[PDB]
Amino acid sequence: GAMNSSNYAELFNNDIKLFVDDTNVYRVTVHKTFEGNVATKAINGCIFTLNPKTGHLFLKIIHTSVWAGQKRLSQLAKWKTAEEVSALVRSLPKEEQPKQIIVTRKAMLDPLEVHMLDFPNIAIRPTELRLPFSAAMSIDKLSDVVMKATEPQMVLFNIYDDWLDRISSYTAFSRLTLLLRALKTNEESAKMILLSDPTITIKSYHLWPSFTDEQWITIESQMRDLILTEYGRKYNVNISALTQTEIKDIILGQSKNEWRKSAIANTLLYLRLKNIYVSADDFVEEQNVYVLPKNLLKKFIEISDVKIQVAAFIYGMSAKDHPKVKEIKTVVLVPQLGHVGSVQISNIPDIGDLPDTEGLELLGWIHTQTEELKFMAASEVATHSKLFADKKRDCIDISIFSTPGSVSLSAYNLTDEGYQWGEENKDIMNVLSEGFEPTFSTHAQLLLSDRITGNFIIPSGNVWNYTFMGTAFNQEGDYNFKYGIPLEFYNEMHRPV
């Protein structure tokens, strides 16, 4: 079973996998020796070994000393790669050793297999993707250490920089392959994109410029721009006639202790409440005004996670002479399978059987996130459309962004463009947002208030976080509910036995 954009999803599950690229192993330069005579001398190379989940790059620098008088070097390069890749795997603890080792080029299959025979439960996979890992030398920081290299040496790198603090692995790898593919297409223009307004620089310990979550999107857009542009020259067919999958395919080449650590991290989320910022755009008196109880914010934060998104539904009502003042009365925590940058949410809850629900109107949904945007993220838009396209479109999106020291609330409505675009993308996941617009959503007037106080509705089963219980999570489920205090993200009732 080869790998293509079909099983592209599996790359990021909890099974260690390594990519191997050997395009950059055997390299030479047309260099003039003393006399002035021209001839190709061999220069340092490297093995592009990449764990796509954690972003760990095991770049093995291949010094030119190894090509010492060897015959037929290009043939040997494939066996010296297999040798070193094998050597690597064997040095990792049995827990860190991968399930699959995906090679970028067919010619690298056999050599690796031969050296990995005593490792049968470690598969050696080919790829029907012609990934842009060949352009790993574009990265000056890498290209440098390889040339700088004076002797054979194993150099470690993180290729996602610090992205994984904000976005998922899935989305991280996307951004990566997009960058590398751009460089592979037109290196100068690709770099020009990354290296304009020098106000945004690249840190020492980083390979990439320090863009904001908002800046990153424009960058990626400019990358797709640059890539599709020059695919509409090699085949010069009209680019604006591609279906999403085609665009996606063009870019690809078609410890119980770890648990208790992030749990502790969440016990500190409540501290971020001592500095609260509420997104204030310009508002018209024709707009509704949503007042959010501060206790409902305080608690929602406390039960949320530092990375993984936590979402819930919001209910409320109005008062005499002003239906435009929407009071949030209840937050409904529902069975959900959260991720990083997205959240799988179950259907709108059946709270009719509960008391005091009489008269409550569904205001929309509230959720947390790791990114920092002035607009609904592609994921949000997608989730919002699946939720309220048919039901109730005047629903709002209360987006909570949290970071050490402060929280940041924002309310959004979704234009008919957004709802419509959210349908034709039931589930896309990021860095391929061809059709996405920041103006898909507009600001909704939100106010926090310790002048009113709301309550919670929880699943009658008490559990709501199925992130670690994915198998026992029915999204179409017909769940029953009840009032009660919601539990923490890493509550011992949320962990797999």
Curated annotation (Swiss-Prot):
This is Pre-mRNA-splicing factor 8. Functions as a scaffold that mediates the ordered assembly of spliceosomal proteins and snRNAs. Required for association of BRR2 with the spliceosomal U5 snRNP, and the subsequent assembly of the U4/U6-U5 tri-snRNP complex. Functions as a scaffold that positions spliceosomal U2, U5 and U6 snRNAs at splice sites on pre-mRNA substrates, so that splicing can occur. Interacts with both the 5' and the 3' splice site, as well as the branch region. Has a role in branch site-3' splice site selection. Associates with the branch site-3' splice 3'-exon region. Also has a role in cell cycle. Residues 289-418 form the MPN domain. Changing R105K: Severely impaired growth. Reduced growth at 30 degrees Celsius. Strongly reduced growth at 16 degrees Celsius. It comes from Saccharomyces cerevisiae (strain ATCC 204508 / S288c) (Baker's yeast). Component of the U4/U6-U5 tri-snRNP complex composed of the U4, U6 and U5 snRNAs and at least PRP3, PRP4, PRP6, PRP8, PRP18, PRP31, PRP38, SNU13, SNU23, SNU66, SNU114, SPP381, SMB1, SMD1, SMD2, SMD3, SMX2, SMX3, LSM2, LSM3, LSM4, LSM5, LSM6, LSM7, LSM8, BRR2 and DIB1. It comes from the Eukaryota. It is found in: Nucleus. The MPN (JAB/Mov34) domain has structural similarity with deubiquitinating enzymes, but lacks the residues that would bind the catalytic metal ion. Residues 7-254 are annotated as: RNase H homology domain. Transmembrane segments: none annotated. Present with 468 molecules/cell in log phase SD medium.
